[PDB]
Nucleic acid binder design. Structure first.
Ligand SMILES: [Zn+2]
Ligand SMILES: [Zn+2]
Ligand SMILES: [Zn+2]
Lengths: 32, 153, 60, 46, 320, 169, 85, 49, 50
RNA sequence: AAAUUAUAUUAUAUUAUAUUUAUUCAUAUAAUUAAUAGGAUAAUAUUUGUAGUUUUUGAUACCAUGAUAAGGAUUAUAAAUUGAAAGUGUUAAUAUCAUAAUCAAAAUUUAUUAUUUAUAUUAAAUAUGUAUGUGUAGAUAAAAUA
């Protein structure tokens, strides 16, 4: 069993047109 | 890795042993079937009750062989050796010369191991007999090369 | 017939419906599968070719 | 087997019918025994 | 691997290891070139008002990545860790973007970083023909430059063996050739800079243009000279081989010390958590996620807290 | 923001161990010979303990002079086990050492730390299929000198396998 | 798929003895209707054993792979176990 | 050694028939019945197709 | 020899992975007259369902 | 309201309404391990259940892939030839699980009142009123309500 990583802000209604390092910083709970 | 899991190696080796048992048993089973299922007399020497007694005795000999390979060849002639995908002989899921599936043939085409020439997918390749009559004509041409060119003796 | 497309001067098939395996005269005149292509398939189609050229213990 | 032998008759020649003679070796690709497993005649496998 | 002397040839444990590792072959299969099939295109990773980061992941069978920084004002591009099995997509990208390639940054001179370097310089200079491309590197990697051929021996890279590396040619830091009085494509490379190990936050930078500064950081442990790039205005840390996703670099290679790697991880604690760390291999992460979820940094700081004077951390199985 | 690295104030020394991936190592299950406790399976824990007590010891590889491996054959010919050796009393050990084993005074001195601690002869699982790891924890009399930890409960000869089944052996 | 080469292989009055049965009556019963050698007993018999007179006469046990034939009759005599089920 | 068809095996057919007649008793070979010998016990054994 | 428990055992098989080992604690069936003498060894019952 | 992009060709379909079957599904299962070994026409080794036991089948993840649609320009000044046909550029939406600790779905085979879709069976009925699909298919040789 692997526990998925969690962020504070919801991922619903987030734009997928962001850059790759912006989504990278966004998903690891440390946004730019 | 590494090549293929060992259960598939066991399966291919059991297929090879079934082929070897076919080579072991086919002549004996064919002679027993051709004696036991004949109604005409075998010879001038053996007729009447001797022929029926000999047919019953060879039927008793044929039924007493535990493990005699009477299985036809086309039932397990679709076994692949590199991968575990099972194809069907007669369809496009199997190639007959290198004896692998369509998936394994595509991987060995894309890997560069074979020396195969690509031709247009709606033509008949290059073989004049294949362009002439199709698969049946090349089938008959392989028959004519293998058997019918020899005057039997 | 020479005016057909698949013309080969030997009769490739006998005109007999139901010339099957149960008939003993078919069994008598059939080719046995001893040293046909099946023997090459039985002794060559191995999942690793190196187990067909030697024993692995001997090479190591 | 004792209740199976009523409706099904027994034809048991014995193990002699499973071992063909030496003169029929090359007709049977070198073999003599008609077992379900193959039988090699060398002592190294045996 | 190493040179086959008399002791290595009369050893039975050597033949036992070469049987255990590689089976009946005994020779290691090399690291081949990626073919034209199963090769992806160049992705634009980041777009900013200052710079543009364009990269390609898994460009080698070493599973390394290739990145290029583009200055939006000066139209100057900068490759970091130039190792791509196909540097023809990059030259076409530079020519179709109307860019000028002026320098190539090198973190360290392992074979997963400088394998296609002469191919990069030759193809990009040939496109510039229709000032040459400089190389930025640390001189400690000189000891890894001389073993570029031996590393090309063991990993099967035979066509890149007989190639004089551009870092070995005569720069402005070297004496000049005294040619006969009766040429300069290979005799002198004026565009070459040697980075110093005394890296500070004041003057250890490269003026990329438009007020963008790239601070190179000296961080050994995976190599004797290992230079990260840090862009504080863009929060981008090209780590190279020091830090990856949930793992750090190897120490089980020559000239690699675990306590140097531990000091290199300890000199990274003053950066903010939203700094996107960009490794030479694998997927990119952030420094805060590596402070929270990386076990090598946890072991390093735990050994530092319990009182180890020589904290030694490092991987033994991973990326070269 | 600068996140601190999560450490601990009190950490056991087992967590200071090295892994090349800094991860948990693989624990492969033992081979199929250890599925049933038999006479071939009984004395493999006794063999490895006498093997370690005679080999080299420490970082400087100090060779143990007394060879306790010569007494392994006479111990298994009597049918006594390593777990059965811990059940013997003090008077039953003087009879076993002097009469049967003929253990000398220095060979008795190298074997007694293994009997004083009552080492549990349970083969631990390891990254390989062939395991040479015996649990060196001190056993307790309530759990049959098996130390009662990680599932070694009063009949467990091997980690990951069944109990002793003393009605058979 | 080829013709009648599937590896996984009905009442009729004028085609009773000729549908899923042997072509000739001169041929003998198959191998499962006789005992080959030394047997410890079979759990089930094959589907190609011909129901004979002694199946309905003796009636010890008929186990077909399951199927239990406990209603003996003479309308099954001369026919294999395929059409009887 | 003969090869191919069964017509080329003259001595092998003779040796096989001699061996089959040698090992097999007649009291075993009596029990094997044909299809019509079993079908004779049916109440309606014979009709035209 | 397993003891019945309701707390899972967590066996860490790696970083961010573990293994949850708990067992569902089987209950005995009802003792009414229809469950008694059930033909479990047969698996092909033909007794009529009232 | 023009230029024609348009393929076009013909056939079929259902609980009429019940029955048998090819696959699907249910519930009963069998199958298990590892390694070599040279023999006639050869100047002399008698030899092979022997050297193997704690043997191998054990890392399915959140990387930056790639497919879809759309718009551009160049060449015919010849009546000869079997044959006047070929190369080169930009935007939207969708999408991206390969450096990690396992294990038999349909790895995979076989069978039973039972679940389907198909397989062929398969019929009465003029007292009144009556019963229009999407698709599935084979080779491809008509054309102007916008
Ligand atoms: Zn490196
Ligand atoms: Zn690297
Ligand atoms: Zn223990």
């Amino acid at each position: 069993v692997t526990k998925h990583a969690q962020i504070d802000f919801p991922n619903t209604l987030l734009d997928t047109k962001h850059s790759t390092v912006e989504q990278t910083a966004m998903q690891y709970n440390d946004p730019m | 890795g590494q090549d293929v899991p060992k259960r598939h190696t066991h399966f291919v080796l059991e297929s090879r042993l079934m082929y070897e048992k076919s080579f072991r048993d086919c002549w004996l089973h064919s002679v027993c079937r051709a004696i036991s299922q004949l109604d005409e007399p075998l010879s001038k020497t053996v007729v009447g009750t001797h022929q029926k007694m000999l047919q019953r005795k060879v039927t008793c000999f044929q039924y007493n062989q535990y493990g005699l390979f009477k299985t036809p060849y086309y039932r397990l002639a679709n076994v692949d050796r590199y991968h575990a995908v099972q194809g069907v002989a007669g369809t496009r899921e199997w190639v007959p010369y290198v004896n692998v599936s369509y998936w394994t043939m595509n991987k060995m085409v894309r890997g560069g191991n074979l020396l195969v020439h690509r031709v247009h997918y709606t033509g008949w390749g290059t073989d004049s007999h294949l362009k002439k009559g199709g698969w049946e004509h090349r089938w008959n041409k392989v028959l004519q090369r293998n058997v019918l060119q020899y005057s039997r003796i | 017939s020479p005016e057909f497309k698949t013309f080969t001067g030997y009769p490739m098939r006998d005109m007999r419906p139901g010339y099957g395996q149960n008939l003993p005269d078919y069994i008598m005149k059939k080719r046995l599968p001893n040293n046909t292509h099946y023997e090459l398939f039985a002794r060559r189609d191995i999942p690793n070719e190196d187990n067909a050229m030697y024993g692995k213990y001997l090479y190591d | 087997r004792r209740e199976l032998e009523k409706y099904m008759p027994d034809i048991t020649i014995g193990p002699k019918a499973l071992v063909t003679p030496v003169s029929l070796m090359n007709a049977r690709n070198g073999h003599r025994v008609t077992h379900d497993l193959l039988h090699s005649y060398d002592p190294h496998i045996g | 691997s190493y040179t086959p002397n008399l002791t290595s040839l009369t050893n039975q444990v050597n033949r036992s290891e070469r049987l255990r590792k590689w089976g009946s072959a005994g020779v290691p299969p090399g690291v081949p070139r990626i073919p034209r099939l199963e090769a992806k295109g160049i992705a634009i990773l980041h777009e900013s008002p200052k710079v543009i980061l364009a990269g390609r992941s898994r460009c080698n069978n070493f599973d390394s990545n290739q990145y290029m920084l583009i200055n939006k004002a000066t139209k100057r591009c900068l490759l970091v860790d130039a190792s791509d099995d196909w540097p023809d997509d990059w030259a076409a990208f530079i020519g179709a973007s109307d860019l000028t390639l002026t320098h190539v940054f090198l973190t360290h001179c392992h074979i997963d970083n400088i394998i296609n370097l002469n191919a990069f310089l030759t193809i990009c200079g040939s496109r510039q023909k229709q000032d040459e491309i400089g190389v930025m590197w640390c001189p400690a990697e000189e000891c890894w430059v001389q073993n570029f051929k031996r590393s090309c021996e063991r990993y099967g890279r035979f066509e890149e063996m007989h190639q004089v590396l551009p870092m070995m040619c005569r720069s402005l830091y070297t004496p000049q050739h005294l040619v006969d009085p009766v040429r300069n494509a290979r005799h002198l490379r004026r565009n070459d800079v040697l980075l110093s190990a005394a890296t500070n936050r004041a003057t250890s930078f490269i003026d990329f243009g438009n007020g963008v500064l790239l601070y190179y950081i000296f961080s050994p442990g995976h190599s004797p000279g290992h230079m990260m790039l840090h862009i504080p205005t863009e929060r981008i840390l090209f780590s190279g081989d020091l830090l990856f996703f949930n793992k750090v670099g190897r120490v089980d290679l020559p000239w690699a010390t675990g306590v140097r790697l531990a000091e290199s991880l300890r000199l990274l604690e003053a950066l903010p958590d939203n700094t996107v760390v960009v490794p030479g291999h694998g997927r990119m992460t952030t420094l805060g996620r590596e402070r929270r979820e990386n076990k090598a940094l946890q072991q390093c700081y735990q050994r530092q807290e319990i009182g180890k004077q020589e904290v030694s951390v490092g991987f033994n199985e991973g990326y070269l | 923001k600068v996140s601190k690295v999560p450490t601990r104030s009190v950490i056991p020394a087992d967590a200071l161990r090295y892994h090349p991936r800094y991860s948990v190592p693989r624990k492969m299950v033992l081979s199929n010979t250890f599925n049933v406790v038999g006479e071939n399976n009984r004395y493999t824990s006794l063999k490895l303990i006498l093997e370690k007590l005679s080999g080299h010891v420490g970082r400087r590889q100090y060779k143990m002079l007394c060879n306790l491996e010569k007494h392994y054959d006479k111990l298994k010919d009597e049918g006594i086990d390593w777990h059965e050796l811990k059940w013997l009393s003090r008077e039953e050990l003087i009879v076993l050492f002097d009469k049967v084993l003929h253990l000398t005074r220095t060979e008795r001195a190298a074997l007694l730390p293994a009997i004083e601690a009552k080492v549990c002869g349970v083969l631990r699982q390891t990254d390989s299929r062939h395991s040479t790891v015996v649990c060196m924890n001190r056993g307790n009399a309530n759990h049959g000198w098996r130390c009662g930890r990680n599932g070694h409960t009063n009949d467990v000869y091997f980690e990951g396998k069944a109990k002793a089944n003393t009605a058979a052996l | 798929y080829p013709f009648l080469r599937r590896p996984h292989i009905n009442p009729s009055a004028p085609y009773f003895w000729s549908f899923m049965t042997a072509k000739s009556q001169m041929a003998f019963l198959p191998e499962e209707n006789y005992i080959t050698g030394d047997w410890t007993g079979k759990f089930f018999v094959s589907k190609r054993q011909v129901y004979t007179l002694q199946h309905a006469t003796s009636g010890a046990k008929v186990r077909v792979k399951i199927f239990e034939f406990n209603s003996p009759s003479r309308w099954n005599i001369g026919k294999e176990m395929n059409t009887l089920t | 050694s003969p090869h191919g068809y069964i017509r080329h095996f003259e001595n092998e057919v003779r040796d096989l028939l001699q061996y089959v007649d040698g090992v097999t008793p007649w009291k075993q070979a009596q029990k094997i019945r044909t299809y019509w010998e079993v079908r004779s016990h049916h109440p309606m054994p014979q009709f035209n197709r | 020899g397993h003891m019945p428990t309701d707390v899972p055992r967590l066996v860490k098989t790696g970083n961010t992975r573990h293994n949850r080992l708990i067992f569902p604690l089987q209950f005995p069936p009802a003792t009414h007259k229809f469950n008694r003498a059930f033909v479990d060894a047969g698996y092909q019952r033909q007794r009529a369902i009232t």
